[PDB]
Amino acid sequence: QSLNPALQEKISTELNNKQYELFMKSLIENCKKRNMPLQSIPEIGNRKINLFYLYMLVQKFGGADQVTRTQQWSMVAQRLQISDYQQLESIYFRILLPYERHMISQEGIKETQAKR
């Protein structure tokens, strides 16, 4: 009994990145669904769970340092629902899961050898 907000669930931006975003979105949403499933299509903001989207956003803000410099990470994180207070723990855990990380690892296994 908790349908999506349907407020900030915009899919695709230029029809080109939609493929890259949907790839990580479907993968993360699928794996994460094994722990914290949603009503149907889990989305918050405008798709930012992608390895290219989440990166582009940070670089655009001037780097993680810039986001924290003005203490905006709290607000920005809420946009993608990555740091919603205590909930950030559950989201981080599910996202750090072995299945979730594995699904995304295929796109970049070189990151695995990098270790924590």
- Measure the CA–CA gap between 81 and 48, rounded to whole angstroms: 9
- Measure the CA–CA gap between 56 and 38, rounded to whole angstroms: 26
Phi-psi region of 3 (alpha: psi -120 to 50; beta: other; left: phi over 0): beta
CA 18 from chain centre, in angstroms, equals 14
Contact call for residues 94 and 36 (beta carbons, < 8 A)? yes
* Architecture of domain 1-116 in this structure: Orthogonal Bundle (1.10)
